[PDB]
Write a protein that binds this ligand. Sequence first.
Ligand code: SF4
Lengths: 732, 61, 206, 53
Amino acid sequence: YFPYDYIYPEQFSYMRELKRTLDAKGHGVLEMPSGTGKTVSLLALIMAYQRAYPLEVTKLIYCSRTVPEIEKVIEELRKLLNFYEKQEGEKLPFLGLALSSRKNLCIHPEVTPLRFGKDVDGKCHSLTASYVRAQYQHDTSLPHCRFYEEFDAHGREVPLPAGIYNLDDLKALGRRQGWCPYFLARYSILHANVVVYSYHYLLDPKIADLVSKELARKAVVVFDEAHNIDNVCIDSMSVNLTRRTLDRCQGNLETLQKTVLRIKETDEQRLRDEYRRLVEGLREASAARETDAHLANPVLPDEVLQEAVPGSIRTAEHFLGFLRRLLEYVKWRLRVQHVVQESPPAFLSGLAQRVCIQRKPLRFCAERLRSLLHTLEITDLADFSPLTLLANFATLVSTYAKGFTIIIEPFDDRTPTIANPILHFSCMDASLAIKPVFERFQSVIITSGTLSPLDIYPKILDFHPVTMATFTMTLARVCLCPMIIGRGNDQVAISSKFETREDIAVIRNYGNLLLEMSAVVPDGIVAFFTSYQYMESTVASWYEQGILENIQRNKLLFIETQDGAETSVALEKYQEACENGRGAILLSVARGKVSEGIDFVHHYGRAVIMFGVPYVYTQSRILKARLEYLRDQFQIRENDFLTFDAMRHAAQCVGRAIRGKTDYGLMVFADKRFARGDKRGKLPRWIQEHLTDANLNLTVDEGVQVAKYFLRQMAQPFHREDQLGLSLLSLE
Amino acid sequence: MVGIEYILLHAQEPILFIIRKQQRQSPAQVIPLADYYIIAGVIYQAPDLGSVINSRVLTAV
Amino acid sequence: LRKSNFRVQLFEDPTVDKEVEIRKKVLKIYNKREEDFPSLREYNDFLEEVEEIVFNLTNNVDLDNTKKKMEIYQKENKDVIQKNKLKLTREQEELEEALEVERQENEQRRLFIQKEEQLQQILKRKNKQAFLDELESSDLPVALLLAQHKDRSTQLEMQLEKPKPVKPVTFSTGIKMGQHISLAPIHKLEEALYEYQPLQIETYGP
Amino acid sequence: LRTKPDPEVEEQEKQLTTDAARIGADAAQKQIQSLNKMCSNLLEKISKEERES
Ligand code: SF4
């Protein structure tokens, strides 16, 4: 049951956390210090619950947010697999399925090395179940999808795989025995005992990626770092719509008509046999691997699509419905570009004036979009991809709009002119994204190492039996140095009151507080800016005015790019440029997606400097409806979460460098807003012993010697740090 | 006990005292039936805006 | 052009003549068809009948008098028109009330915000001025601290209170009893004349 | 605020009630239907005769 050595008295602090949340079917919220193996804590009891079957049943789904750390989950549990294996004697059967679908896909050297995921998987599925489903037999057009054919033969066969694999395993096994990740995974979902994949993949309302069978008997799912659920769920149902998309769609309108015109009865009587079968008994014909290729369920919590074949009986008639839609939709676009308008169910009502038959052909469209292409089975998917966007949209507008939100954003965001207007359909109820989750599941446990206010689980608007505060001791001398700055000499203004471009007199001493941090602190630092143009504003005075003149002389600097390609470059450098004779401080952005998937080690990356209040500051009026609805839920929330949204991202970013429990961390706080907000947002285990013991308005020049005093002592021989042997009560 | 409850609606101290007839389905649920107004200690029933007009047009024509 | 037939529409592609003609004719005639078959739809075949003739006109087939002379001759045109009269009176009553409750509530909400602003401000402005006149020329029995602590502790629990006082919506009981407006009923019970029958006669005899 | 009319119209109403007491039910329905059909037929004949120009 892997105590395996001194475990820094925590597994016992989490032992009863399982036994309360699982034996009593507790939903459950865990605080966890960033300095704790996210699974060595959790899975060691979870895999212990896998062996300890209660009445009978113990499922496992797990998810996280980044596919390298997904494999890092897998990585040491293989020894945990091996650990008790020798100890309990023999070895029982196991499976953990890393199912990163859209990522690793085809071994074939022609399909494979085209860069993006979705379009190339469209080439794959167009080849498999659109070319070799339409043109079944053949020699050259059939090509060579041997791995899918191997799966079809293996469907009759019953193998038994080994343990949990990776995305590089099925790749090398593609030339050996594996029949490719997509289907070997379908056969392994049949008897899966543990699934790990992305937090995103489950939470796709666009294509409803139903992972298991809907079996809520004991559906046992585990959650780590589940911080920005809104930024998942609302963005999971967020619908962007380009004018350039529509005109391309306008161009393949009559393009598809030419396919209709050239086909007289060949694909048309193919429809006629089965469109009659659509009327007689309803059954999907694209339910092979095309169910996950097409919009599985845009609006999942519905009863059924009972009266399919909506007010539309023919195909060009159905095509005219989109002519009735799109051409009206640009009429619902182009005039509307003068005023931002937030009217979600009023739009569909005014649409009902314009659309002749509504609310059934709005909801029964995206399949009849697809199915009238399914009798074709011709059009390449990336060509058809901006169209599937559209029949997704009014389908979403058809069903869930009165609780949800329509926003129209034509004006200046990377367009200085009006050259690309856009609108968006957001949802608002991440609850209603996670209510079907909860109804499909048993009672499933969030763990977030950043979540200090427990009051934000009712921002998820849900119920909780178990929600406490995890308190761990530190006989490791001192876990960390949290250091709120508040300079008095250079007069702290670190919140953007006079904003990131309103004055540079604020900015005259962020270099000073950094270079001295650079001068003292060795061994690589990853700091967090607010945004890319903020970052662009950050270094804007830094070149022309004299700033780097000692900064490059002390360590070096790793610019992270708006483009993720060049952003991954310095990364290749930073893991190297620290581990050689160079400190090489990396420079980065909190809210940007450079802040996940890393888990910095004492090897490289052991200090973080705050820069400003880490709040949104960018997207207009996505607030107000989201604001007023929680004001329709709890009514004093303007002040409230608009603190915590910064805070939930802060230690999400900031509290990352410390792992194990001796790994160090210098998480200083250059901030103007600290009085309650930083204190509310910091962990109750972390405000208590460490944050502002007697160090609040710590001018950097004074705070210089703090880290000096910190490290020099803390780099002395560590004879023993909270050594546990046998069980001696202690009772916390 | 919710039901037929004649209740005073508006009152002028010397003479005017209007009474309303309500039929309650439940507490906080009121259905107005009719209005009887007392002028100078003389009780009349409030005429409907429309029965009065019908009779009036009939006599004139 | 018959009588200078021109029709302005503000969009990127109004050039689709087939589509503009389709929209006008289909909306007028086929909304009466929606109040003929989809009104009492058997299943999907009733809106499928409408769609058959919708397509049968958009192609400039000129088989329309064949259907115009059987258009309303089998059923009642007044029964058609009255449902058009029903739905239009329904929807205009429906849309205006939807427009009003979104006009009333948020304006009532922001005024409730506005008065709570006015609540917290002058409270703070006055209770510290009362505290000022209370801090001086006062008895303060035990020490100069007493009721000036007493007042320094009573005024924080007040912040919560008086929310109801800020908004009173004029008057709806004395001023005028015509503020009811939002009326409702639809009550049922169906329970009467129970156990009137008196025949419980039992026997094992003549 | 009065509604009750004068004795003249009230007397006319009592005469109307005696008239209601005569022909009634089946007879009344037959009379109404006959009057409507005959009036419609007369109006139709008049309109057709006018249609000449
Ligand atoms: S099925 Fe397996 S092999 Fe065939 S395309 Fe998709 S990956 Fe490439």
